[PDB]
Amino acid sequence: HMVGQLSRGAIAAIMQKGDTNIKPILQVINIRPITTGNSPPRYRLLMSDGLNTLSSFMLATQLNPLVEEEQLSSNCVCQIHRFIVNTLKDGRRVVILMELEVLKSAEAVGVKIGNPVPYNE
């Protein structure tokens, strides 16, 4: 019952209700740098709550060391302690992760948990 470790429904609650008081437990599915320019790199995450995945997660620049020193990597399980939602002009929403704790390393989790499906925004 590995999906029981994840906050199933947190993604829908964030995107539909604007709920930002929750501290959801999510799994990183993928991380990649996004094209920036001459400034700190930015990192985009495909995250899963066990039910849905969402590719619109952005890491605050102050958390870049977690990715660059490899504690925050694909498959790891983390709990979001502070995040904000920003809505673009075209209506799509960005979840910016400001504070998070890696609960279990990627090496200890090992695999994608469950079969989450892409969230329909």
Binding site: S55, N86, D90, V94, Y119
Partner: peptide, 12 residues
């Protein structure tokens, strides 16, 4: 949910 491109993503 058509995925947001990087070009419009640090748009804030």
């Amino acid at each position: 949910d058509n995925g947001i491109d990087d070009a419009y993503f640090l748009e804030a």
